[PDB]
Amino acid sequence: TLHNIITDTENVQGSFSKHEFQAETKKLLDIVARSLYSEKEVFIRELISNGSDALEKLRHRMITTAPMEIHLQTDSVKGTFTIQDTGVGMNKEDLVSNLGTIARSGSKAFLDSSSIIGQFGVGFYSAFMVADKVEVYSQSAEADAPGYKWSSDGSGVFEVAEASGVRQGTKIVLHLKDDCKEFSSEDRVKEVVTKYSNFVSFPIFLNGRRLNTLQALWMMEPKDISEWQHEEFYRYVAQAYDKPRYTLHYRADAPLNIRSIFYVPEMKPSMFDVSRSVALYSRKILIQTKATDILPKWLRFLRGVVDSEDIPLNLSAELLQESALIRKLRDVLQQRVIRFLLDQSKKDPEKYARFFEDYGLFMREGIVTTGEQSVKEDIAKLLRFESSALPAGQQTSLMEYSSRMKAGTRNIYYLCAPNRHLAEHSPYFEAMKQKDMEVLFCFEQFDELTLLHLREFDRKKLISAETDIVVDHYKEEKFQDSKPASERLSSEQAEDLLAWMRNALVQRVTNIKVTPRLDTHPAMITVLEMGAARHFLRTILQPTLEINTGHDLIKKLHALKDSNPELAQLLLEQIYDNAMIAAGLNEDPRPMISRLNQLLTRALESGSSAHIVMVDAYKPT
Amino acid sequence: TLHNIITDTENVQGSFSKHEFQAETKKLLDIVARSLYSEKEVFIRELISNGSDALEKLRHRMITAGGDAPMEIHLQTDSVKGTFTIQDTGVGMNKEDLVSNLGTIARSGSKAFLDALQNQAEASSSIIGQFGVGFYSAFMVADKVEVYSQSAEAPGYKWSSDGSGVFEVAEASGVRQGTKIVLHLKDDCKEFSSEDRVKEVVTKYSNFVSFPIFLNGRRLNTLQALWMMEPKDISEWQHEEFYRYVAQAYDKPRYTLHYRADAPLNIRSIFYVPEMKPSMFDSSVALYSRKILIQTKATDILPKWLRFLRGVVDSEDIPLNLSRELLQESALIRKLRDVLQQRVIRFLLDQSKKDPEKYARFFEDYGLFMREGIVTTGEQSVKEDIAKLLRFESSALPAGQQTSLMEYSSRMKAGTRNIYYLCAPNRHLAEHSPYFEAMKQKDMEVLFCFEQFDELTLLHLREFDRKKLISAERLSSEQAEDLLAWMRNALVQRVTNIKVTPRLDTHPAMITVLEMGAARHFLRLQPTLEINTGHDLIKKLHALKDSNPELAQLLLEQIYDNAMIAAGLNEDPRPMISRLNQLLTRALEDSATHIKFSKRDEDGKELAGATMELRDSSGKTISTWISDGQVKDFYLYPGKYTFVETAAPDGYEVATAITFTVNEQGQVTVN
Ligand SMILES: Nc1ncnc2c1ncn2[C@@H]1O[C@H](COP(=O)(O)OP(=O)(O)O)[C@@H](O)[C@H]1O
Ligand SMILES: Nc1ncnc2c1ncn2[C@@H]1O[C@H](COP(=O)(O)OP(=O)(O)O)[C@@H](O)[C@H]1O
Ligand code: BEF
Ligand code: BEF
Ligand SMILES: [Mg+2]
Ligand SMILES: [Mg+2]
């Protein structure tokens, strides 16, 4: 039944020889040049990072005055990229051991400055991605040493000679290959600096002009950032022209080190873009997330930045193609954002209402597409509704509903209608008012779908009014009519009428019934799973028609079936249609307009009238 | 104002030494085992790739120096000891090859083997390894690695290391032909001694590896790489099954494209379009190379608008990043994306011919993707490529029938080069557009674009076929004028115009709109109601406005609402139902009493030309008019009034004023 081959069979014979690992240097160089970094442009990042590190080491040495800066120069005529830093520079032994040895990083021995970027000992070789020839001039700041020129074609060997006129620091000259002339373009080189190296701690000059490098706001003390600095920084990170309506500046080292700023734009989101967002950093250097989480999909409306020292970097930079503790970070961020937004609702409900109006669709999306019930409920805390127990216009929440529920109660009742007036005057609400439960009023298009997917909240089942009305037939229909029996059809009249209606609506309705639960309305359509039926139509519903035998229209229909039978049927058809529309279960309303106009004319029938008459006498002469 | 210190101030002084690049072996091992891959689980991919390569070399040897051995990769987990073991029955390694290949970073025996083959040999395209580092991925997850290997030539060996710069080699007995690798897993990596976990990783990366893969004596990879087979030797049921696997889906593909080509690059690929339409409540095309997963969500190979496709793309010669989970930046990959874009467009176009019906359903479901593509791309040539897939309706065609921009370009009058469209919520609002009524009479055909984002699509399209798209953008004569003047006051802030028109027939009124752009924002407004003065409800409305003003208010409101519905401008009439019910009950049951006034001669025939006033008991003139040879209607409320003749026509005597009373019961008396 099983096919295995692996067995404990092997035994060592005699002694072992010991060996050291070695390297195929030529092929390592090729790997760094062609196979290590997925984008050619990052040689700029790597060289700037090296210059920044050389400057940090000098700064640190300076404590134990001169300028500390990084210069870039593009010669589009000579096809040349030059970078020069005023840092510690390198001696002969340093040029040989650090530059000449792959995976050797002098920026490690440096152990006494979380400012140091360099780690791997390969970044420098990225120059050979874009250059036939690389020359290095370095002057190890120190009374002893002289200058040096380091030189290589990138294959196999390199040569070093003593040099004069070498300024303190290091200059590196890239003779660009014809493939890569784009990096002798000033506009091109500028694009790259501001992409990866825009938060570097020393000034960078490009062809004599100082680049507008920035402060890493996310690393700084939240209380020291003014609203205006956030406005500006938002515009930078979101590449936007408006300002944030909310700003969340979150630091933690709790489960994981986190330094982050999130913004909600003041603009409403584009509906085009919704169907068609935060940057990830470490050590002030950009790190890529294409095809990665950081935030869950429903929080893609947020803009801003996340930095976490617990995220390891691969040898290139990207990495972000993971699920480890990213999934954790994402869960932490989601929780914190929900808490932030709940707090904004407390502070300023009216402002939150505007937020919810503009961004609520993201919450609904999040509830609908999550499989995790606890997450659905967390996000659900952000939803807002009106209530039958609160004045019109006043927003409430599932939490506040829960806190008004009497000790006995175990369900949350809701009603979805286009607006406050229609909900308040809904036949489904009239029926519910005979009970003493609070009803949530939900006015937005996908609120019902949302609550259907939510299903329950804090162990309380969500039930639509329409559903609850149906369920009550299968319990005690112990409800009394709104009007005394004198204002209703007698039983004999009700039965006679119903039997007529059943014949007139044979294959349109499952059954027809009187209900004591209506007041203003002549009838209503009921369906057990009303919400799901409404949802299905967005592309027969064993519907029940329930009539109010106290309503003027119903009573008139009773008469009409024996006086103008054809008019009675037209009326009946219209009452059903009106109940289907009120139920939200109506197909195209256009084909009913014909009947309605016809009905309207036949209903509306002048009379006879009283005449006052004046005679004009003729004059004589 | 500039600051530069870069100057040619250096000079080469004296002689120079030549030095060879070196390599810090210790640190480099750490880099592979720590800082190379996004996930630790990837050591399983690498070791299986190596077993596949070993097997492939053995298979190649036996073509020529034939012999008889089964070709298999075996994995074993031990959850008590915390070990992961992989064994292949491939070509194995002698002592020299263990020291050379395993002991030297970036040395690849498999690469050398590849370089010596005829490019035509099958092993040329199935050997995976290139870099000579994949093996060091074991130290990511293992404190100790043991390799037992027995070459196919004329002694077994055990290679052993902790991964800290040294390794040991000793002779070993009992080693089976091939190679066995035993990982003693780190404490934080013990999950790879779990069978279920290892199974997840094997199926993720290595499910299509050419050789049988066993785990704890059970076979895993039962899935053959359909994209490498001849399109003709694959059945519809194989596609359905493969689709479901590769898309993780449960429906069938509505469309299947099996594309092979050796052109800009080796391509073996299969694309599917799902049968199920997508929505809000919510995999991609995967990238492979030599049957191994590179990216579950391929990024650079397709344009974003084709993200609705599922399936797989495999290329043997696509340039891989060292991590094997990315592609290098490449002009070849750019060309590939362009080629695929064109192939899929070509395929969908062909499908619109073979079955326009089916393609019509496809365009309804996925058309938004095409519209997005046209808006987001910057190449005019490609915009017009994707635009060949668009369907609209036309002014020159019946309702509900689709046409392409090409078919429009077909029918155009010989002396013209302009594409006229009109983006409307619906057909009614289109056919009755002022701007379109222009193009009806003198000019000719207009595209009707009802779908959302149809507008900015064409705006972004700009130009198609070297041509330019441009948006083309009873009751008497005084009874009616009276009615109109009343209507403008009850609907003061609902419409910006009220007209009278002779169409309608069955319809008492219709809504028309000038700007379609507005109407969208409205259901995203300045309507124009137009009245049929021959319609019974309108003539009823006319009569009730004075007689039963409150009833005529409901009726008016209803006629307006009914017209907005008939124009598709109000899709959810819930706001009107309570009112409509009031209208019905009141219609089936006025306060003002109808009073008809006759001015006559001595024979009792109606007399024109008399100036008349009606005044109330206070003396106030309520109304002044001239008799015109027919009866005059008034509607008065309870009180006392007087009809006064203020001028008689020439040759007639002025009659005595007539005083009358209307009471609360609607009965009238002359006093
Ligand atoms: N501009 C510079 N000035 C001084 N030292 C430098 C400079 N650039 C590189 N180095 C030295 O060379 C080493 C190698 O650089 P690189 O290959 O990028 O590795 P790292 O990851 O250490 O930065 C560094 O560790 C540093 O000691
Ligand atoms: N299971 C095996 N059987 C025989 N040879 C192997 C096996 N695994 C690895 N090798 C040899 O070791 C070399 C190093 O493997 P690896 O570091 O993955 O580099 P590569 O990219 O060449 O596969 C291979 O080129 C191959 O010659
Ligand atoms: F700049 Be080093 F390679 F991290
Ligand atoms: F498996 Be090798 F490093 F490509
Ligand atoms: Mg560096
Ligand atoms: Mg390998």
Author numbering:
A (entry chain B): 85 to 148, 153 to 200, 209 to 372, 377 to 639, 652 to 717, 722 to 737
B (entry chain A): 85 to 152, 154 to 239, 242 to 369, 376 to 566, 588 to 638, 653 to 717, 722 to 803
Please quote the paper that reports this structure.
Heat-shock protein 90 (Hsp90) is a highly conserved ATP-dependent molecular chaperone. Hsp90 is a V-shaped homodimer, with each protomer consisting of three major domains: a C-terminal dimerization domain (CTD); a middle domain (MD), which has been linked to client binding; and an N-terminal ATPase domain (NTD). Most higher eukaryotic cells possess four Hsp90 homologs: two cytosolic isoforms, one of which is constitutively expressed while the other is induced by heat shock and stress (Hsp90β and Hsp90α, respectively), one localized to the endoplasmic reticulum (Grp94) and one localized to the mitochondria (TRAP1). Using TRAP1 as a model system for Hsp90, here we investigate how ATP hydrolysis is coupled to its conformational asymmetry and propose a model connecting it to client remodeling.
To generate an ADP-state in only one protomer, we make use of the observation that the MD-Arg (R402 in hTRAP1), the only residue in Hsp90 that contacts the γ-phosphate, acts as an ATP sensor and mutating this residue would effectively mimic the ADP state. To address this concern, we crystallized an equivalent heterodimeric construct of zTRAP1 (+/R417A in zebrafish sequence numbering) in the presence of ADP-BeF. Heterodimeric (+/R417A) zTRAP1 was incubated with 10 mM ADP-BeF/MgCl2 for 1 hr at 30˚C to allow dimer closure. As predicted from the DEER results, the heterodimer adopts an essentially identical asymmetric closed state, and the C-terminal-fused SpyCatcher-SpyTag complex packs against its symmetry mate in the opposing dimer. The structure shows that the R417A mutation does not perturb the overall closed state. To avoid model bias, the dataset was refined starting with alanines replacing arginines at positions 417 on both protomers. The Fo-Fc difference map (insets) show strong positive density for the arginine only on the buckled protomer (ATP state), while the R417A mutation is on the straight protomer (ADP state). This is completely consistent with the interprobe distances measured in the DEER experiments correctly representing the buckled and straight protomer conformations. Altogether, this demonstrates that the loss of the γ-phosphate contact within the closed dimer is a strong determinant of the corresponding protomer conformation. The construct used for heterodimeric zebrafish TRAP1 crystallography (+/R417A) has modified linker lengths appended to its C-terminus to account for the offset in starting amino acid residues between SpyCatcher and SpyTag.
